[PDB]
Structure formats: C-alpha cells, structure tokens
Design a protein around this ligand. Sequence first.
Ligand SMILES: N=CN[C@@H](CC(=O)O)C(=O)O
Ligand SMILES: N=CN[C@@H](CC(=O)O)C(=O)O
Ligand SMILES: [Zn+2]
Ligand SMILES: [Zn+2]
Lengths: 450, 451
Amino acid sequence: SAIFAERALLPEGWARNVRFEISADGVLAEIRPDANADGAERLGGAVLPGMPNLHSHAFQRAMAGLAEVAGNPNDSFWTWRELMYRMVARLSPEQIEVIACQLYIEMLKAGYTAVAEFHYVHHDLDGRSYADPAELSLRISRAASAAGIGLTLLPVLYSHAGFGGQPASEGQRRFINGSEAYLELLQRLRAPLEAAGHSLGLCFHSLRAVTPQQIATVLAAGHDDLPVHIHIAEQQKEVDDCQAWSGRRPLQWLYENVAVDQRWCLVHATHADPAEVAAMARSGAVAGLCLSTEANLGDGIFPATDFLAQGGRLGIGSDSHVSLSVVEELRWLEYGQRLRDRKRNRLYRDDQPMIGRTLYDAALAGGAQALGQPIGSLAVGRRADLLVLDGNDPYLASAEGDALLNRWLFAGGDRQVRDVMVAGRWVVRDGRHAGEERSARAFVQVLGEL
Amino acid sequence: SAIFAERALLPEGWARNVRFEISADGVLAEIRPDANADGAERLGGAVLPGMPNLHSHAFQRAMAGLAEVAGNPNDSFWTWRELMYRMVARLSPEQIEVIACQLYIEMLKAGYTAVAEFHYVHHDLDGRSYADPAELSLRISRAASAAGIGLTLLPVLYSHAGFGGQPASEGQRRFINGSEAYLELLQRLRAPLEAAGHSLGLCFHSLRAVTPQQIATVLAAGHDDLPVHIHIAEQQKEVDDCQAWSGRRPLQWLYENVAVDQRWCLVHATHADPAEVAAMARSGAVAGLCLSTEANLGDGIFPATDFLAQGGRLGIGSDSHVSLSVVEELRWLEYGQRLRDRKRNRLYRDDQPMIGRTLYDAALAGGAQALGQPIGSLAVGRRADLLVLDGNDPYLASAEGDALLNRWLFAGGDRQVRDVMVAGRWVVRDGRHAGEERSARAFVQVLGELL
Ligand SMILES: N=CN[C@@H](CC(=O)O)C(=O)O
Ligand SMILES: N=CN[C@@H](CC(=O)O)C(=O)O
Ligand SMILES: [Zn+2]
Ligand SMILES: [Zn+2]
C-alpha cells in the first residue's frame, strides 16, 4: 500500500511530498520525494522514523511511581531494588503478560515502535522452572504481538548476587539459570520467535550477576550475529565492589577481558571515567541511556558530551518505565548535560548545530543497532516503522524541518504524536490503539491483585 | 451551584464523597465530606486544588524550543537572552495579547489555575510610552480573562543594565521606567485589575536592573499588602558581579539591605550558599522555582532539600514556558535533587514520607502565598479553583490517596488532567478549552508574523 507525507525526515534529511510504497511484508519498497499523492493515504503531519526503545523490564511498569515513599534518610537504588524484589516475587505468568501488553500499547502511543525486552524473570514463585522453561519469555513475545510492537527479546543470564560468584539471594530466585540451562532457553526460543517475526539477543544481567567464565561460555556458543546486552556501571557501589574484586572499574574490566564491539549494548554505563568513555566510543558499542529511570533511581549523569564528541553511539530505553516518553528521555538527556555544565546547547555535532535533530538522529541509530533490527531510518529495504506528528498543532504547523524537531522535543510533548505505524500496520491512529480498552480492563484488575 | 467528588484532596487530607457548594461569585461556600450527590454534578475523577504558576513571561512561549541551536562551543544564558531581546523588539500589543491568551489556555489544560505574570514589556518599539502607559499590562489582563485563568499581574520595575545603575541598553528600551513612572503605572492598574477580578504585585526585575534606592522608594510607597517579586541569583555571573559591586552575594545583599518577609517571592534563587538558604527559610519568603526553564538555561540545581528541611516555602513557575506541565516541574524538582545526591526520595517532610504529596502540598502553599490570592486549598472562603484527574485511568483508578499523587506525578502525565475549574467556572472539560480553536488560529498567524 502507499502513504503520502507533506513532510518527512528521510536519511538524507527533511523532504517534501514523499510518497512511500510499502510491501505486503511491511518493508519500505519505494520512497519518492516531490511526488503526487495519487491515491495514497495522505498523512496528517510530519513523518519521522519510529524510535527504538533499547531497554525494558516490562513488569516494573506495574510499580511505577509506587516507590516514591521515603523510608530512610538515605533511600537509594538499593532500597528501591528491595521493593522491586518483593513485587516480582508475587507476579504470575498471566499478570506478567497483561502488564507487558498494556506497557507496549503505551510505548506505541509515545512513539516507541520497537522494544528490547531485557527479560530476567524466568521461573515459578519458589524458583523452580515452569513445565515449559520458556513460559515467561513466550508470554512476553505474545504480549508484543498483541500490542503490535517490534520486539528483540533478551533472555537474561543471571546466576549470582555479586562479584566473585556470590550465591544468589532468595530475592533473586526467579532469575537464576546456569549456563547450560540458559543456552537451552535460547535454543527453545528460536522457533517461536522466528514465527512471530521477533528478534533474539544474548544478555548478561551485569558483572555482579554472572562470572567471567560464564561470559566466555555464552560468547563461544555460536550465536555470533546476535546483539549482546549488559547492565554496567549504573551505580557507584557496583564500581567500588568491582574495584575490591578485580582492582578494575566495571567498564575498564569489561574492555580488558572481553572483545566488546558493535554487537554490544552497554546499559546505563553511567560511571565511566574519561578512559572508559574513550574505549566505548572506539569500540562502536551502544550506550543504552535510560534518562528518566537513572534520574528516578539517583544513578547520576552520563558523560554524554564527551562520549558524543568522540563518535560514541547511544540510544534510549524506558527501563523501569516510570516514564514512557520519547520526548522526555531526549529532552532530559540534553537538560542533564546542561545542569552539569551550567551551559546550554550541549549535544550537537560538528555538522549539525540543531540539538533536537542531533538527539533524534543519535537515538534512532543507536537504538536500531542495539535491537539488531532493520529499523531507525526510512530507506528502501528497512521496515516501515514510523510516527506521524500533529499537523494541526500551531507550533509544529508553523515550523519547518529541524526547527520542528526542536518545537516538539523541547517545547511540546507526547500528545503531538498522533499516528504510529509498525511493519506497515497502523497500530496507533489519532492517539488511539484498538486494544486499549480491553488491555486497560485486564490491567486494572491485575493492579488490584497486586 | 454544587459539585461532588468521590475523592478530593482537602486541607486535612484525602476525603471521600465530598459535596462542594460554590457561591455565585465562585467562592467555596460549603464543603461536606461523606455526603450525597443530589442536585450536584458528579465529577469524573480525583479532585485536587489547582496549581498556582508563580512566575511567567508570556511572550517567551512564542520562541519556546527555537533557541536550541548551537551557535557557540559553549552557549550561554546571555546569548539566549540576546536572542529573547530580538523577538521582544518586534512584538505588537495585539501579538502580545494573542500569545498570552493561547499560553494561558495551555496552562489551564496542564492544571495551572492561576498565574503570576512577571511583566516587563511596557513601551512602544522606540521605547516611548503608549498613549495609555498601561496598554500592555491591560492586554495581559484581557488575555487572562479570555482564557479564564486567575491572574496576579506583576508590572516590572526595570531601569538599568547592571549593578551600580549602569545605563540601560538599547535592547532593553521597552522595559524601562523610573520609580515614579512605575508607581503611577501601579495606581493606574488598580481599578481595571479589580474590575476583572485580578490581583496586583510589586516587582523588581533583578538587582542588576534596579538600584538600592529605587527599591527603597517602591517599598516605602505604601502598598504594604502586595506581593513583592524579584529574579535573584539565577546565574553564577550575577553572583560574581554582585560581589564585585558590593562585596556581597545577591541573596546575602538583599537580606542585609532589605526587610525581606512572607510578602516576597525570590525567583530562582539558584545560587544560595548555606547562610543564604537559612536566611530565606527563616524569613518565610517563597522560593520561585522554575525547573524546566532552569535546566533549559543551564542555571543549575537549587538546594531544595536543605531549604525545605529548614521550613522553606516554595512554588513552581513555567517562566520561559519551554514546558507547561505541573507534572514536569514537580517531577524534575525531585529528580534534580536525586541526580545531585545520587539518592532517592529526597523531598519529604518529617510528617509526610510521600514524595508526591510533599511536592504538591508545598507548591500549592507557596504558589498561593506568592500570588497573594485566596487559592491553593479547598476550604470554605477560598476560590473554587480545582482540577479533576482521569477516573478511568487504570493507574489512578487502582490507587488511593497519596499513592494516587505518586502515580500521577511520577508515572503519569498532563493528559491525566481532564477537567479544570477556575473561580467556579469550568474552563477545561475532558481536556478541551472552549476557546482553543479560535485561539490557535490567531496564534499560528502570529507565529508566522514573528518568524
Ligand atoms: N535499574 C536497575 N535495575 C536492575 C537492578 C540491578 O542491576 O540489580 C534490574 O532491574 O535488574
Ligand atoms: N530566565 C531569565 N529570564 C530573565 C532574564 C534576566 O534575568 O535578565 C528575563 O526574562 O527577564
Ligand atoms: Zn535495566
Ligand atoms: Zn523569569
């Protein structure tokens, strides 16, 4: 089928009167600027590539905002995690699926067209495996199918409570697999994920949760085409503990011991010294920045200006899902750099002075790379994932090109996203998703159960 | 008239089945918890007092988001300011009113029910006064009335380009009044403002823009019942320059030379050292925190936890209007403290662990004080200014009490605000303002004219 955009952000920049042909399998087949609409569906506003969400723990949306209660004069990431543990202890397979489906609907409405699910809840309530060990992974895939969002599933290897292979704690029992069970899970998942059109990646929870020898095992297992994700250097405590264990910082240790490259997504990477920042940018790995969660958890501020100046690659994730907003993540990525430096206009390129466009270009590319999917740009052969902004909005209607990105990302909000397409299929129209009522009804029931 | 809420945040806390009686003049006449909804409008979700917006420069909304372009390797507040000066040089009285009306509609949709307009654009393009010196102030009052938002107009005394009574620059010419002209402007405004149900306050632009003697003149002029607002200590450069001028920091200087009290709103106050924070808290002045604008301009992070812990009073303002969101300001107020300390759950009270409720309670109280209006709480004798959240939203519907505030402020957004009432009149219903279509058409045309 064909769609027609008066304005669209193409790989070479903004274009006018672009007619897109989309094949039956949801792939961009033809892109012609300066064309006639000729029968094609005339879109209602400016068209951009959809934004990949490169980091998600779906079930956490259920408790989003609920952990904002002072129980200590020094509440932190670590007291929060205790609360997150107590909540994950109670989740049934059915509740996990309902929460995921609801979350993916909200993601779509925000302009996220594909998600990397960093999925570590594997087993039953007492830590025993389900009859089908892939139970919860399969439910995540079905939820994504139900919402219609792109999906890279990252089943997570989690084995230990801390550096040096500390025994897993009771709070972590639903997460735990040895390497053999983990590799078997990856194998079980190939057939169903392939049928769904969904993607797969390798994933270590963190250097706290797996041993160096386990990393070696998984990396030698022959899945050499898959993305590799890991939480790293999010909290100073992890840095300190790594130092006491190895005499190295986390990112420093990773680069000394593992052949980190473009396959890799380093989630957070918050506490990266100048040498670590340099190593990251050189490697072509993607920094997975989750700005709203990092602020919510008091993680700190990433050295994004230094990283970007050295050619670093990044993308955004909603992580704990306290925020589901492309606008908020990109805006406060920039604003955090401004608050630190006490200056404006921090994240731009030598060839691109526009801040919004710099942020959007970056997150699109990093996100696509991290998910391992053919997305993040409107070019022939890429998947037809896109969003349509509000053409009747006075700020956007009066703006042109990159000025329009600035109006949206810095002066506007989520409501300016009106229509959302994933793999050639309209999943949000005029702010509405066809599954929203049914999902909200099931979701509110689950919230009551929790 | 009468409305009925299944849940409402009253001054004593959350209550159920609250019937509100509203007088003909839009004042809360009776508030009855655990009542029935007979002959009263059944409200569609949780009811909260409306949020005062304690600091606004309306015209800046027209340029919001457009100054996000690297022009230098390390862009400054002062390069932005020159950019703002460039648009102000073009604004007509009509454009001013149209921008303000549109802005105030958007504010209402976000849950802001009253605004303090920190208004310093006074004169014609060449710096000469309009035939009616109050022309542009009156335009602001007329726009607030068209939107239906509560208004405290703060005409700004602006006389100088810098400490020590430096001559004002050409770019500042539309702002400039001497003390006597400013005081006459205040007198001219009293009748039309009261006729519209609007309030007035005293306002000095900053310590850079007025002299100590001008401050003394204005404060001695007999308007002892009005709020007093001032931009202070926003940028490190102002701190450095004040120090070079007086041997004192800006807040330190103000407290040493002026009787600062509960009438005062100190806008930004970002660079406050420990002694200055203590003096602010002890004085009962309101800190006017404009979080989105402060982040956008790279001002820095206010010591909100230290200030709050000592009994400090605060409220929020949208300032340059890059953001129009009660959610965003309160959320990033807390989050800024989290990023600085690398800890969670920062702004709480000894008697209130709930972060959302701590933030809302504080901003309501400080906002109301700073505006000098009878707002900020649902109590008999206060104005019927309120918002209704979305009762169909699954996050809110499944929450009770302060948990509901946490879901909204930390996990939700502006769209959860559905209905908004100011002075007993519905001005937003189901997310829609009746004047939005007319306003947007005039507004988009003005944007075309300016840009
Ligand atoms: N924001 C971090 N969340 C992590 C916590 C961890 O790294 O242990 C997690 O959900 O597993
Ligand atoms: N955020 C700063 N705005 C101020 C600038 C100033 O203090 O000169 C203003 O609009 O007057
Ligand atoms: Zn994570
Ligand atoms: Zn201001």
